[PDB]
C-alpha cells in the first residue's frame, strides 16, 4: 500500500517542477543590465550608540521613522532616540536568551521572545508612566524565531519546532496554526499590506502562508543549507532569502522561481541578516565576516561595505521613508549610518 | 544649553546610562556552566543534591554564583542555538557508568556508550568550545561495582583485555573518548567518579573552574 503512495508522491513532485521549468523565460541579469550602476557608495557613521553590555540579537525601527528599539543577551530592551542620542527608557526582561523583538505600528506595544517558547508583549503608552507586560502568549514547546506585528490586535509568530501561529492579543488562544517545513523555522517576514507572510526553515524550504485561509499557498526550495533571514520587497510581491552557505537569493511570489543569486568567492561564511530600503534598490546584508555588504538587487555586484564592527553583524533595518540605515553586531555598539 | 525640551531630554540618557552600567556589573560576578551533554541520566539527582525550554538553575558556594544552563527539553537542532552559550566557563558532561555491566543498549541493538562517545566527539571538537574545558562526571558507582562481577565486558567490545576488577576495567574505556580530543593543549577533560551516596560531588567542579580561572588570567597578563 505504501509503494503506490510513494510512487504518486514522486509523480506529484515531478509535476510541479516540470510546470516551474516551463515558466522561466530569461535570467534577471539580462533584463536588469544596460543601465548605470550605483557605483562606489559608502558613508561614514553619522551617529553611534552605546550602553549595551553584551551581544545584541534583534532591533526594530518605528513608524515615526525616528524612534528605535533594541534587544541584547542581557535582559534589557532599550528604546533609542536616533536624532539626539538619548535613551528614552529601558525595559527589563525575564529571560536573557532572546532572539525576537518588534515595535508595533501604532507605537503602543513592543514584543519580545527567545528560547523559552513564549512571546511577551509590553505596553509603552501607559497612563501611569511605565512599561507593563500587556500579554504573554505561551503555546509553543521550543524557541521563537521571529515576531512581526500584523495590526494592533493580530500578531504572527514563528516557532522553533516546525510551525507558525497567528494569535489574538485579548485571548492567548491561537487564531490559526500553520504546519509544515518538516523542521525548524528561523525567519519570518510579514507583508506591508498585512495579508500574507513567508517563513524560512532549516530544511531549505520557504512557504507562503495565507493569513485568512490558513493553508500553504506556495512552497519554495533552494539553497543547500539553513535559511536564517528573509524580508519582503517594499512592493510586497517578492522576498530575499539569506542562507548559511554564504549566498543570498531572490524570489518572486507569482514567478515561483529563482531570479538572482548573490555570492562572493572571497567570503565563505554565511549570512546572519538581510534587509531592504526604499524603492527596493539597495539590498543590505549583515554577514559574520565582521562586515556588512550593500549590493544592488538588480545587479549583484558590490556597491559598498559598512566596515567598522568588531564582531559579526546580527541586525539591520531602514527607515520608513528611506533616510537612514541602522545596524548592530555582536559587539555591544549599535551604529546608525546615514 | 538647548531648548527646554532638550535640556530635560539629555538627562534621560544620564539615568539610563547609570542604570545600564549599574546592572551590567552585577551580572559579571557569576559563572555560567553549560550542560550540552546528557543530564537526564543521573545529573538530575545531582541537581537535587546541591539543595518546555531552557532550564536555568542558580546556586552558590565559596562566594561564587553558578548559573547552570540545563538544556534538557529543547528537542530541536543542537547547532542553531549553540553559539548563544559561547563564552561559558565549563561544560558539565555526565555518564551513568552503568551500561556495559547492565547492557541496557536499546538503541537498535547498539550500546548506549557508542552514542555517548559520539556526543563527546561532537562536543569536544566544536568550534565554539575550543577554549572551554569539559568536566566529566560518572555516576552510579555503587551499582556498577556491585553488578560488574557477573557482567562480561569483552562480549560488548573485544578490544578490551583485562580482568573483572572494578578498579582496572573502567579505566580502559576512558581513553576511548579522551583520545578523541584533537586539541590536548587547552581542552583538558576532568573526572570525579561521583556516587549517589557521595556527599561532596560538587566541590570537585568548583576546584575545576578555579584551574580554568587562574590559567585564563595567565592568558591575559602573559605569564605563559
Amino acid at each position, epitope marked *: 500500500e505504501l509503494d503506490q503512495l510513494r510512487q504518486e508522491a514522486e509523480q506529484l513532485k515531478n509535476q510541479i517542477r516540470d510546470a516551474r521549468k516551463a515558466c522561466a523565460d530569461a535570467t534577471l541579469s539580462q533584463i536588469t543590465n544596460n543601465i548605470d550602476p550605483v557605483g562606489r557608495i559608502q558613508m561614514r557613521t553619522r551617529r553611534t550608540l552605546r550602553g549595551h553590555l553584551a551581544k545584541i540579537y534583534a532591533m526594530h525601527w518605528g513608524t515615526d521613522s525616528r*524612534l528605535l528599539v533594541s534587544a541584547s543577551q542581557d535582559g534589557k530592551l532599550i528604546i533609542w532616540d536616533s536624532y539626539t542620542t538619548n535613551k*528614552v527608557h529601558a525595559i527589563p526582561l525575564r529571560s536573557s536568551w532572546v532572539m525576537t523583538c518588534a515595535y508595533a505600528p501604532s507605537g503602543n506595544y513592543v514584543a519580545c521572545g527567545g528560547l523559552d517558547n513564549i512571546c511577551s508583549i509590553y505596553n509603552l503608552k501607559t497612563r501611569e*508612566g511605565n512599561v507593563r507586560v500587556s500579554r504573554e502568549l505561551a503555546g509553543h514547546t521550543g524557541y521563537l524565531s521571529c515576531c512581526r506585528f500584523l495590526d494592533d490586535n493580530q500578531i504572527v509568530t514563528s516557532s522553533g519546532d516546525t510551525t507558525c501561529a497567528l494569535w489574538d492579543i485579548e485571548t492567548g488562544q491561537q487564531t490559526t496554526t500553520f504546519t509544515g517545513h518538516t523542521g525548524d523555522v528561523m525567519s519570518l517576514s510579514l507583508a506591508p499590506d498585512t495579508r500574507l507572510f513567508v517563513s524560512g526553515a532549516c530544511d531549505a524550504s520557504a512557504k507562503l502562508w495565507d493569513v485568512r485561509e490558513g493553508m500553504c499557498r506556495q512552497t519554495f526550495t533552494g539553497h543547500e543549507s539553513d535559511i536564517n533571514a528573509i524580508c519582503f520587497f517594499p512592493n510586497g510581491n517578492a522576498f530575499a532569502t539569506g542562507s548559511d552557505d554564504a549566498t543570498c537569493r531572490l524570489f518572486d511570489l507569482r514567478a515561483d522561481q529563482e531570479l538572482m543569486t548573490y555570492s562572493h568567492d572571497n567570503i565563505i561564511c554565511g549570512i546572519t541578516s538581510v534587509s531592504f530600503s526604499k524603492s527596493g534598490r539597495l539590498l543590505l546584508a549583515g554577514y559574520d565576516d565582521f562586515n556588512c555588504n550593500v549590493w544592488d538587487a538588480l545587479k549583484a555586484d558590490r556597491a559598498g561595505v559598512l566596515a567598522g564592527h568588531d564582531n559579526r553583524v546580527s541586525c539591520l533595518g531602514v527607515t520608513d521613508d528611506g533616510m537612514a540605515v541602522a545596524t548592530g553586531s555582536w559587539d555591544s555598539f549599535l551604529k546608525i549610518w546615514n | 544649553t538647548v531648548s*527646554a525640551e*532638550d*535640556k*530635560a531630554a539629555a538627562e534621560r540618557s544620564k*539615568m539610563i546610562d547609570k542604570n545600564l552600567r549599574e546592572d551590567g556589573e552585577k551580572a559579571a560576578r557569576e559563572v555560567k556552566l553549560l550542560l550540552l551533554g546528557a543530564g537526564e541520566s543521573g545529573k538530575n539527582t545531582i541537581v537535587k543534591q546541591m539543595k518546555t525550554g531552557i532550564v536555568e538553575t542558580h546556586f552558590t558556594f565559596k562566594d561564587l554564583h553558578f548559573k547552570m544552563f540545563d538544556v534538557g527539553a529543547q528537542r530541536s537542532e543542537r547547532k542553531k542555538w549553540i553559539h548563544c552559550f559561547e563564552g561559558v566557563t565549563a561544560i558539565i558532561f555526565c555518564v551513568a557508568l552503568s551500561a556495559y555491566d547492565l547492557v541496557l543498549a536499546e538503541d537498535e541493538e547498539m550500546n548506549r556508550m557508542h552514542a555517548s562517545m559520539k556526543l563527546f566527539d561532537s562536543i569536544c571538537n566544536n568550534k565554539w568550545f575550543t577554549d572551554t574545558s569539559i568536566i566529566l562526571f560518572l555516576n552510579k558507582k555503587d551499582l556498577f561495582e556491585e553488578k560488574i562481577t557477573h557482567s562480561p565486558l569483552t562480549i560488548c567490545f573485544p578490544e578490551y583485555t583485562g580482568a573483572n576488577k572494578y578498579d582496572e576495567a573502567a579505566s580502559y574505556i576512558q581513553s576511548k573518548f579522551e583520545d578523541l580530543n584533537k586539541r590536548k593543549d587547552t581542552k583538558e577533560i576532568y573526572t570525579h567518579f561521583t556516587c549517589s551516596t557521595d556527599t561532596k560531588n560538587v566541590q570537585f567542579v568548583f576546584d575545576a573552574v578555579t584551574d580554568v580561572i587562574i590559567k585564563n588570567n595567565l592568558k591575559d597578563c602573559g605569564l605563559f
Partner: single-chain antibody
Amino acid sequence: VQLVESGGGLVQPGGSRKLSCSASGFAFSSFGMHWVRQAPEKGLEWVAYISSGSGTIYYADTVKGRFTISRDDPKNTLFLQMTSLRSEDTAMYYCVRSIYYYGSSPFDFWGQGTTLTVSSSDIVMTQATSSVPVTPGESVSISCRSSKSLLHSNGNTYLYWFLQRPGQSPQLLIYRMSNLASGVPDRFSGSGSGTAFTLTISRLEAEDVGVYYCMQHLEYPLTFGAGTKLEL
C-alpha cells in the same frame, strides 16, 4: 491619576511655609515638577521647577532666592519651601508633573491645587480678546500673537493651549503642534500660522465653555497671557 495636595490657609509675610503634593498610586520617579500660580485677573505663571533626579532647578523672572523645590520619592516627600515671603502672595497654586520624550505629551495631566491668603528680555504674548462675556451656543475662535520666532532650530515649536473648565483644575488642548491631549473631547481644536495662533471650539455644551490660555516660551520663564475668562 490623582494628587493629594497639602497647604493652604491664611499666613503673614516673612513666614516660611511648605506646600506639598503626593502622587500615590502613580509612578512619579521620573517626572518634572512644574509649579503654577493663579492670578485672579491675569493668566497663570510658572514659579518653580525640578527635573528627574533632582539635578536641575529653575526659577521664574523675579523669584530667584525665594522658592525652593525639595523632592525625595522614597518617602513621597515632594514639596515647595517658601523663603522671604512677601505680603503680595494671596493666590492659588497648581502642581503639574510632566516629563519630556520624543513624541511625548508634555503637561498632559494636571493637579488639583490649593489656595493661600497672605495678609495685606522676557517673552510676552498678546491676547486678541480678554474678559469676553459668556454666551452659550456660539462657536469660540480665539487668536494669539508671539513676540519672537516660534520655530526653534529643532523644529519643536512651543504651542500650549491650556483650557480651564469652570471648576477646580484645567486641562490641555494643544501641546506642540495642533495635537489633541488625553482626557478631552474631540470638539476642541487648535491651529497656528506664523506668529498667529488659534483656538477653535465648534460644538458647544455645558462643559465646552471655559477659560483659555496659551504659552510659547523658548526660555525658562513660563507665563500665560491676559486672562480670557468667558465667565467674566
